[PDB]
Swiss-Prot record, chain D:
It catalyses: a ubiquinone + NADH + 5 H(+)(in) = a ubiquinol + NAD(+) + 4 H(+)(out). HAMAP family: NDH1_NuoH. It comes from Sus scrofa (Pig). This is NADH-ubiquinone oxidoreductase chain 1. One of its GO terms (cellular component) is respiratory chain complex I.
Swiss-Prot record, chain E:
It is found in: Mitochondrion inner membrane. The gene is MT-ND3. GO terms for molecular function: NADH dehydrogenase (ubiquinone) activity. Disulfide bonds: none annotated. It catalyses: a ubiquinone + NADH + 5 H(+)(in) = a ubiquinol + NAD(+) + 4 H(+)(out). This is NADH-ubiquinone oxidoreductase chain 3. PANTHER family: NADH-UBIQUINONE OXIDOREDUCTASE CHAIN 3. Core subunit of respiratory chain NADH dehydrogenase (Complex I) which is composed of 45 different subunits. Interacts with TMEM186. Interacts with TMEM242. Core subunit of the mitochondrial membrane respiratory chain NADH dehydrogenase (Complex I) which catalyzes electron transfer from NADH through the respiratory chain, using ubiquinone as an electron acceptor. Essential for the catalytic activity of complex I. Pfam families: Oxidored_q4. Belongs to the complex I subunit 3 family. It is an enzyme of class 7 (translocase).
Swiss-Prot record, chain F:
It comes from Sus scrofa (Pig). InterPro entries: ComplexI_Subunit6, NADH_UbQ/plastoQ_OxRdtase_su6, Nuo/plastoQ_OxRdtase_6_NuoJ. Core subunit of respiratory chain NADH dehydrogenase (Complex I) which is composed of 45 different subunits. Keywords: Electron transport, Membrane, Mitochondrion, Mitochondrion inner membrane, NAD, Respiratory chain, Translocase, Transmembrane, Transmembrane helix, Transport, Ubiquinone. GO terms for molecular function: NADH dehydrogenase (ubiquinone) activity. Gene3D superfamilies: NADH-ubiquinone/plastoquinone oxidoreductase chain 6, subunit NuoJ. Belongs to the complex I subunit 6 family. The chain crosses the membrane at residues 1-21, 25-45, 47-67, 88-108, 149-169. The lineage of its organism: Eukaryota, Metazoa, Chordata, Craniata, Vertebrata. This is NADH-ubiquinone oxidoreductase chain 6. Its EC number is 7.1.1.2. It catalyses: a ubiquinone + NADH + 5 H(+)(in) = a ubiquinol + NAD(+) + 4 H(+)(out). Its main location: mitochondrion.
UniProtKB/Swiss-Prot annotation, chain H:
It is a multi-pass membrane protein. One of its GO terms (cellular component) is mitochondrial inner membrane. It is found in: Mitochondrion inner membrane. Belongs to the complex I subunit 4L family. Core subunit of respiratory chain NADH dehydrogenase (Complex I) which is composed of 45 different subunits. It comes from the Eukaryota. The chain crosses the membrane at residues 1-21, 29-49, 61-81. It is an enzyme of class 7 (translocase). The keyword NAD applies. This is NADH-ubiquinone oxidoreductase chain 4L. Its EC number is 7.1.1.2.
Length: 70, 347, 114, 318, 115, 175, 83, 98, 105
């Protein structure tokens, strides 16, 4: 044997691992490494739009902290 | 069919009509129409046979089309003015579609073909319901929007209804089809005066309903659906034939009978406007309805037709079921003209 | 039907608060505690006038109060606040729940200093 | 960058389906005192590749009496829908983040039945037609109760968003709160995927190949892939809905591993159930779903509406 | 936009698989090969003849029971209202009405298939 | 002019309507209605109505499954008709397509009153909202208000559904 | 009281599914009216601030309205933290 | 109005026209009825979304409910007609005349 | 015809959903709340016939808000003139209408 069924299960598990890990890594790579923003409502979308406008590089992920307020 | 289920369906029909009559929201009025139709369809098929099935199918198709156009007119009115209240109907195209949909529901000419067919295909009780109770909701809606109504379309359909009712009734030997064409002509009379005075519409509706109830109850009492089967009633119950003759005379509009009152008041109201030609044509045309009522009276009451041997057995038995409101309906159908000024309480 | 009155572009200029959403969320509770009065004045003007052109000076006062608040935070609690808003910013939903140590340190800093 | 994500989702799913065929064959063999594939490749590891290459190099037949357009459309719809039903699943992050993910799965799954319907009708043969009407009956059997069970379970989530299910079950699995609903949902997913004991549409003993009897080669292969992808997807949905993995925002790999293990266990349970039971009669499935499942589901829906209000345990996010 | 791209990608992959399946292998079609399968003997009638539905009444009931699902789906949001007593009365009213309709059809033999 | 997505979706909606209105066969008509339901879901989605679009798509999928079964049972014949198998069906289909194309050209190049009012186009982005507020979906709150504001609607709807069950049982009784 | 007990036993012996369904439905119908936390759920629903609280103009005659969020006046959520 | 409004109204008119002209099958006309219902749903939803009328978001659900009732009614009548004639042709419903 | 049962008993069966300016959940306003409010207040109690004439201005404003026909007419006129100017080469549109602006929060 019954442990000879295991290689197929391992291959299936490796195949099924790929989507979740790939999605997580691609989300991190395209969002500054910090977990792509969720906007289920218009207020969060407005926050994201405001962030994009003040970044200066037209990207919402770049964040301006206390050094941007002189 | 279970009596409890039948009573529930009748109450659902009446609930839909009352919801139409008491609502202020267009959606609730449309819902009332849907509920009324849904409960009405099985009542037409209570005695199951192919003719009843065909009548129910035709009725369903006509009324579903009418309700679809009704909803579209409501939505167009909402689009051009965000109003759900039943009022002057701020859009003219929506008003035209609304008028056509309500005319389809009532059976006004040009859309009058379904009425003779559905009436002939169902039983006399179903016909009574269809030709009396089913006129209330569309007429109430038409009364509530009478100000925004276009006279040219409504008057055209009313005159066409009177003409077609008379001409179609001239050709019938089946009593249910005669009743249907009579209903078409009376609907035409009701809608002719609607743009001028809704009180006259209500008065005509009430008088017509009374006469129709009396006629249908007399027909149910003497189980006749054809002219020849009604020609036997004199040899079994002559009083029924005499009362039917007087009620038929009343339906014709001859004074001093109660039937004459709505036509008289509508003619007066139309002459209070300018409107001279239209009432003249309407009266001349109602002469045709009088003609075929008179032919029915000739066949059933004023002459005696040959009978059969087996009527002797029927002579020995009495009518089991008794209609408690038939005498009052006959009296109201015939002897009510002197109380005409009481119509003031209708407004 | 008449011309629409509009303020000139010069009348619309003001010192801008240019911090991202995560910084604002991190500082929001203390900002609402400290800058309450000008914000309430501006909101009352906004909801009574029903016209944005009549409450511009109040908006400028709101901006100045926010700038003063953030200048104080910079002057006294720079690093704890930076850690707190970095923590808040990492989250995709920007959740308060996942960073309580940083919030506690920032709260202690502001309570002692100010 | 988004196309890379689409490919990284859809290619591994097809590989998982291909190797699930082998895993099912081996599990059934070992439960039947035999081995299963173990010759072509070490431990039958190359058997799926051989099956696919044999099927795609085999002649495809268009029946003389069949409607050709629908006959070709049906497998395309099946495979594309099976691929699409994966995009809102959070693992722990979804490819497509929807406000109403659950309703999207409901609608797409109820669209998927037309693949079987149209293939069976367009084949223009009697066994295919019988399979198609069995599909109609099966959908009528399971749909209403499936939807009500979903609503009852999600009344504790607070929304229809799939990602909220992770935070809802942060401390306890949802199966400890709604295990009767979990049982009915499991049987409903068995019926929804045309799996034994509810594999009525194929009806192998009764109907030869049933709905897909006319189909051969590559077109036939597409139907098989769609069905097995649906198996895996429905079990992943069940794992997310009832056995909630704990998610660390700085280590999503742990969540992914745990979730994959759970869905693999559920798929192996599907294979076990197939190996263990006989087939229903398709009127008996409708009677089971309408006379036993439906009243209990309505009662439990009433209970799950009432319970959060009585206990002041209403979820957030109106 | 992303969902449209996903739909396009999936449909394109399925279409390409069909295209490869139909253009790669060798085709040898002749009339016997393409004839309808009925276990080795020619079918008597057509498969387009009417096929009776013994569960027709349950199918119509499915149409009505399906619309009550649309009425019950907004319930998660309805639980957030301030007047929880009116909402809970109305949710139970709808579900009791739906159970009564099942009880009526069950007792009138509406769930039994025609023979 | 922005990507014309809504206009394309509405055109495909009209095309599916023409497809099932030509009445080629019930099997084909149901397919056209399914396509129309899908594009209508898309049109409503592009306006913020996610719930309503998904709901109408689900409802029409169930309805068309029942219709497919009923077509197989009661509305079949030896040679079912397609849009190119009959001169009447093909003529109606082509007439509908040409009417739609004529109306589109007429309203797109000119600014004319077809029947009700006029229209110049510009894409339906213009009349949008630029509304910036909320932790909730306004459509969801409105639909959920059925259980607190719409008590009368709930009553009449539930009664009508129960009556519909009774009505279909009475109609199909036969005898 | 004696025939209904036998009816209950027969139903449990023949249709356990229906017995369970009816019991669950009845409990769900009657329990919410007897629970003390229903009003707690109502209060929690009423305490969720979806929209902005527009302040009131001071006319000098509202002692019960706070002049600052941290003032002792106004409603309190202290009951919620103990729940 | 925009182009989408005209397109939806055109779809309604086409479905109405489809219902008005009968071919042979009754089921086709029932499909046209459902199409009119769908068109009305889409039009009302677009109007209500555009004007941000919050309490009107629930009317199209009611419309769908009564559409389902109407479709069930039509299907029952079709079952009866087919049981009578073995076909759902509208040519067979000619027992009653005007 | 119309039996005002609601008015007689004070029930409010459907009046809550008749107009856009009537108590929406969470106080969410309609897009044309002010225009409908003014049209209703102006026409209240004077009857239908008088209202159609003396509240024509408020109703016209409300319909303009609802459908926005004059607004698109004006915008299309402006854009047509701008396109004509650029085609002959006499406008030179500003940098902030071409995407090279300096955005503000
Ligand atoms: C202007 C717009 C016009 C739109 C055209 C619609 C697209 C179809 C065009 C090609 C199909 C006809 C080819 C053919 O008949 O055989 C060819 C040829 C002839 O074979 P034969 O043996 O010599 O003789 C066969 C006989 O003639 C007899 O052959 P038959 O019995 O098979 O003929 C039936 C066929 C013949 O077609 C016709 O009769 C006239 C065509 C007009 C149909 C349009 C009706 C409207 C339906 C709704 C709207 C659909 C979208 C339209 C909008 C397009 C713009 C986006 O009609 C159909 O089957 C229509 C199916 C197409 C609809 C696809 C929708 C997919 C549904 C998925 C679910 C939806 C989800 C929600 C959204 O055989 C082949 O080459 C193989 C089959 C070809 C199939 C290819 C794929 C299917 C069609 C593409 C679908 C595109 C979807 C995107
Ligand atoms: C009880 O007897 C039975 C069995 O047991 C012996 C069965 O197995 C069984 C099921 C049939 C089996 C023989 C399985 C057959 C395997 C498939 C049909 C082959 C499908 C494999 C591919 C098409 C998957 C996709 C191909 C790629 C390799 C995947 C990657 C895709 C690219 C795009 C990359 C049946 C029906 C049965 O009755
Ligand atoms: C998994 C999905 C993604 C994969 C990505 C790849 C997708 C590949 C695309 C799908 C098709 C795959 C099939 C591959 C086999 C070739 C089939 C066909 O294209 O070849 C021939 C196409 O050729 C045509 O018959 C005529 C020849 C070319 C027509 C001239 C058109 C003008 C083109 C200009 C040519 C000049 C030089 C080209 C270079 C510039 C058809 O021959 P035919 O026998 O019927 O079909 C059976 C093929 N057999 C023999 C293998 C069994
Ligand atoms: C005179 C003859 C009487 C008997 C015949 C009655 C015929 C009609 C059937 C039922 C009568 C309808 C009256 C109820 C109308 C509902 C509205 C009213 O009751 O107020 C509601 C109160 O709701 C209560 O729960 C009463 C409704 C309880 C319904 C019980 C079921 C009765 C239906 C049975 C008959 C219907 C057909 C048969 C199906 C079973 C809402 O109150 P509230 O939420 O504070 O305020 C809303 C405003 N907000 C939003 C600003 C807050
Ligand atoms: C590789 C060479 C390319 C040739 C292209 C030919 C395309 C074509 O139509 O030919 C028909 C071709 C070959 O048939 P034969 O002539 O009999 O054999 C050929 C061998 N000599 O048959 C096919 O394979 C048809 C392939 C399907 C068409 C692909 C596009 C279909 C689009 C479907 C859209 C609907 C999708 C439904 C689901 C989506 C809903 C969300
Ligand atoms: C088939 C029907 C496809 C249904 C697709 C539904 C996708 C979906 O639900 O996602 C909704 C998603 C996001 O909405 P929310 O989750 O509420 O929040 C977003 C704001 N933060 O909305 C969208 O992305 C809309 C994008 C376009 C809408 C979909 C259009 C698809 C229409 C398909 C038509 C088919 C093509 C034409 C021919 C068909 C058959 C040949
Ligand atoms: C879904 C997962 C799998 C996807 C499918 C990918 C499969 C890729 C495997 C490629 C294997 C190579 C194909 C070999 C089979 C080709 C068809 C065949 O065998 O026919 C033999 C045939 C017989 O010809 P004759 O002797 O002249 O006539 C005798 C009849 N009177 O010989 C041929 O035609 C050979 C022509 C070569 C075919 C082209 C192969 C090239 C590879 C294409 C792969 C496609 C991927 C894209
Ligand atoms: C304090 C307040 C709490 C409120 C009450 C809560 C407790 C309620 C307790 C009862 C819950 C029971 C739920 C069970 C639901 C179905 C029960 C049932 O009766 O169904 C069976 C049918 O169920 C089945 O037999 C299933 C058929 C398919 C079997 C396929 C394989 C079996 C599944 C293997 C294990 C599945 C594990 C499920 C969960 C997986 C994880 C999600 C009825 O069929 P018959 O015996 O023929 O009788 C009906 C007519 N008299
Ligand atoms: C009070 C709240 C109510 C709401 C909650 C319930 C939610 C929904 C549940 C009801 C759904 C519909 C009910 C279906 C009715 C079935 C009618 C029927 O015909 O019953 C027979 C079975 O006979 C019965 O009636 C079963 C026994 C009587 C009904 C079941 C129990 C009724 C209530 C008993 C318990 C009451 C409360 C529990 C108290 C527990 C005591 C401590 C069905 O069997 P057949 O299919 O006909 O078999 C044919 C093959 N030979």
């Amino acid at each position: 044997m019954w442990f000879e069924i295991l290689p197929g299960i391992a291959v299936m598990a490796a195949c099924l691992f790929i989507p979740g890990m790939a999605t997580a890594h691609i989300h991190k790579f395209t969002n500054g490494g910090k977990e792509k923003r969720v906007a289920h409502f218009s207020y969060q979308w407005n926050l994201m739009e405001r962030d994009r406008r003040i970044s200066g590089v037209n990207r919402y992920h770049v964040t301006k902290g206390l050094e941007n307020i002189d | 069919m279970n009596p409890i289920i039948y009573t529930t369906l009748i109450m659902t029909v009446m609930s839909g009509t009352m919801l139409v009559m008491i609502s202020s929201h267009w959606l609730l009025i449309w819902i009332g129409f849907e509920m009324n139709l849904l409960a009405m369809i099985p009542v037409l098929m209570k005695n199951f046979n192919p003719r009843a099935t065909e009548a129910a199918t035709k009725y369903f198709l006509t009324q579903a089309t009418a309700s679809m156009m009704l909803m579209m007119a409501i939505i167009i009115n909402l689009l051009y003015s965000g109003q759900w209240t039943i009022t002057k109907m701020f859009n003219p195209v929506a008003m035209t579609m609304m008028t056509m949909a309500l005319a389809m529901k009532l059976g006004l000419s040009p859309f009058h073909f379904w009425v003779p067919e559905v009436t002939q295909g169902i039983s006399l009780q179903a016909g009574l319901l269809l030709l009396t109770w089913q006129k209330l909701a569309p007429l109430s809606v038409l009364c509530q929007i009478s100000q925004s109504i276009n006279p040219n379309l409504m008057l055209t359909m009313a005159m066409l209804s009177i003409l077609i009712g008379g001409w179609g009734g001239l050709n019938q030997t089946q009593l249910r089809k005669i009743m249907a064409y009579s209903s078409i002509a009376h609907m035409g009379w009701m809608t002719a005066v609607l743009p001028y005075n809704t009180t006259m519409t209500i008065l005509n509706l009430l008088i017509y309903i009374t006469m129709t109830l009396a006629m249908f109850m007399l027909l149910i009492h003497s189980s006749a659906t054809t002219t020849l089967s009604l020609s036997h009633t004199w040899n079994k119950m002559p009083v029924i034939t005499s009362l039917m003759m007087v009620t038929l005379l009343s339906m014709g509009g001859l004074p001093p009978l109660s039937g004459f009152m709505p036509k008289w008041m509508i003619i007066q109201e139309m002459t209070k406007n300018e409107s001279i030609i239209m009432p003249t044509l309407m009266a001349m045309t109602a002469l045709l309805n009088l003609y075929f009522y008179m032919r029915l009276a000739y066949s059933s009451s004023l002459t005696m037709f040959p009978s059969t041997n087996n009527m002797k057995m029927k002579w020995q038995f009495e009518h089991t079921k008794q209609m408690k409101l038939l005498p009052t309906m006959i009296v109201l159908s015939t002897l009510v003209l002197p109380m005409t000024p009481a119509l003031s309480s209708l407004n | 039907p008449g011309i629409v009155e509009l303020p000139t572009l010069e009348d619309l200029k003001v010192q801008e608060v240019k911090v991202s959403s995560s910084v604002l969320k991190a500082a929001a509770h203390h900002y609402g505690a400290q800058c309450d009065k000008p914000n309430k004045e501006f909101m009352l003007c906004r909801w009574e006038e029903k016209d944005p052109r009549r409450c511009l000076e109040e908006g400028k006062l709101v901006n100045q109060c926010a700038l003063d608040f953030f200048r104080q935070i910079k002057r006294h609690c720079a690093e704890p606040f930076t850690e707190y808003w970095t923590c808040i910013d990492y989250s995709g939903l920007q959740l308060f729940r996942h960073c309580r140590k940083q919030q506690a340190k920032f709260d202690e800093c502001v309570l002692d200093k100010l | 960058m988004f196309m890379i994500n689409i490919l990284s989702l859809i290619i591994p799913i097809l590989l998982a389906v291909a190797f699930l065929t082998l895993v099912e064959r081996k599990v059934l063999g070992y439960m039947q005192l035999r081995k299963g594939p173990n010759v072509v490749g070490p431990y039958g590891l190359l058997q799926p590749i051989a099956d696919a290459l044999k099927l795609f190099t085999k002649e495809p037949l268009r029946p003389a009496t069949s409607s050709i357009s629908m006959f070709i459309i049906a497998p395309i719809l099946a495979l594309s829908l099976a691929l699409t039903m994966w995009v809102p699943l959070p693992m722990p992050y979804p490819l497509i983040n929807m406000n109403l993910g659950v309703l999207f799965m409901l609608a797409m799954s109820s669209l998927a039945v037309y693949s079987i319907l149209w293939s069976g009708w367009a084949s223009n043969s009697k066994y295919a037609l019988i399979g198609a009407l069995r599909a109609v009956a099966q959908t009528i059997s399971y749909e209403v109760t499936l939807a009500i069970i979903l609503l009852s379970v999600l009344l504790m989530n607070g929304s229809y968003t799939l990602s909220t299910l992770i935070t809802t079950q942060e401390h306890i699995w949802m199966i400890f709160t709604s295990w009767p609903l979990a049982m009915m949902w499991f049987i409903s997913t068995l019926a929804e995927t045309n799996r034994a004991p509810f594999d009525l549409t194929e009806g192998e003993s009764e109907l030869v190949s049933g709905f897909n009897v006319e189909y051969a080669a590559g077109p036939f292969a597409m139907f098989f892939m769609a069905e097995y992808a649906n198996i895996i997807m429905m079990n992943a949905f069940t794992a997310i809905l009832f056995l909630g993995a704990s998610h660390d925002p700085h280590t999503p790999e742990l969540y992914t591993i745990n979730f994959v293990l759970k869905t693999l266990a559920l798929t192996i349970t599907f294979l076990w159930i197939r190996a263990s039971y006989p087939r229903f009669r398709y009127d008996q499935l409708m009677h089971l779903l309408w006379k036993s499942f439906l009243p209990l589901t309505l009662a439990l829906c009433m209970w799950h509406i009432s319970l959060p209000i009585m206990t002041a345990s209403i979820p957030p996010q109106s | 936009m992303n969902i449209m791209l996903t739909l396009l990608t999936n449909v394109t992959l399925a279409s390409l698989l069909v295209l490869i399946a139909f253009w790669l292998p060798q085709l040898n079609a002749y009339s016997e090969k393409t004839s309808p399968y009925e276990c080795g003997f020619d079918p008597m009638g057509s498969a387009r003849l009417p096929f009776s539905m013994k569960f027709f009444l349950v199918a119509i009931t499915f149409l009505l029971f399906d619309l009550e699902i649309a009425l019950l789906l907004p319930l998660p949001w309805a639980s957030q209202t301030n007047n929880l007593k009116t909402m809970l009365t109305m949710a139970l009213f709808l579900l009791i009405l739906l159970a009564a309709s099942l009880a009526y059809e069950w007792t009138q033999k509406g769930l039994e298939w025609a023979e | 002019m922005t990507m014309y997505i809504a206009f394309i979706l509405s055109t495909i909606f009209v095309i599916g309507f023409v497809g099932f209105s030509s009445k080629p066969s019930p099997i084909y008509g149901g397919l056209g209605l399914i396509v129309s339901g899908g594009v209508g879901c898309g049109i409503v989605l592009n306006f913020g109505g996610s719930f309503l679009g998904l709901m109408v798509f689900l409802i029409y999928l169930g309805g068309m499954l029942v219709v497919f079964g009923y077509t197989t049972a009661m509305a079949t014949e030896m040679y079912p008709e397609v849009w190119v198998s009959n001169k009447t069906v093909f003529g109606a289909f082509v007439s509908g397509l040409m009417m739609e194309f004529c109306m589109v050209y007429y309203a797109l190049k000119e600014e004319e009153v077809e029947i009700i009012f006029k229209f110049n186009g510009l894409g339906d982005w213009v009349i949008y909202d630029t509304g910036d507020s909320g932790f909730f979906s306004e459509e969801a709150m409105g639909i959920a208000a059925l259980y607190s504001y719409g008590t009368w609607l709930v009553i009449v709807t539930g009664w009508s559904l129960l009556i519909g069950v009774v009505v279909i049982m009475e109609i199909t009784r036969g005898n | 009281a004696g025939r209904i007990a036998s009816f209950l036993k027969n139903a449990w012996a023949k249709e356990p599914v229906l017995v369970a369904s009816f019991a669950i439905g009845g409990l769900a119908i009657i329990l919410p009216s007897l629970s003390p936390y229903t009003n707690y759920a109502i209060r929690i629903n009423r305490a969720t601030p979806y929209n902005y609280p527009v302040p009131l103009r001071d006319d000098g005659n509202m002692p019960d309205v706070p002049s600052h969020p941290q003032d002792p006046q106004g409603p309190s959520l202290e009951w919620l933290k103990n729940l | 109005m925009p182009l989408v409004y005209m397109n939806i109204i055109m779809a309604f008119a086409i479905a109405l026209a489809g219902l008005l002209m009968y071919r042979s099958h009754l089921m086709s006309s029932l499909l046209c009825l459902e199409g009119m219902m769908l068109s009305l749903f889409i039009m009302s939803t677009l109007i209500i979304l555009n004007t941000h009328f919050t309490l009107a978001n629930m009317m199209p659900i009611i419309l769908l409910v009564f559409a389902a009732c109407e479709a069930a009614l039509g299907l029952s009548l079709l079952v009866m007609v087919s049981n009578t004639y073995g076909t759902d042709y509208v040519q067979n419903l000619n027992l009653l005349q005007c | 015809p119309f039996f005002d049962v609601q008015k007689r008993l004070g029930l409010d069966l459907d009046r809550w959903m008749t107009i856009q300016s009537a108590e929406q959940p969470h106080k969410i306003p309609g897009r044309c709340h002010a225009f409908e409010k003014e049209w209703i207040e102006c026409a209240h109690g004077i009857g239908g016939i008088r209202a159609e004439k003396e509240c024509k201005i408020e109703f016209d404003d409300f319909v303009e808000c609802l459908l926005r026909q004059k607004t698109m007419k004006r915008l299309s006129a402006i854009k047509r003139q701008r396109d004509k100017l650029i085609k002959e080469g006499k406008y030179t549109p500003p940098p902030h209408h071409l995407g090279k602006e300096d955005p503000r929060p």
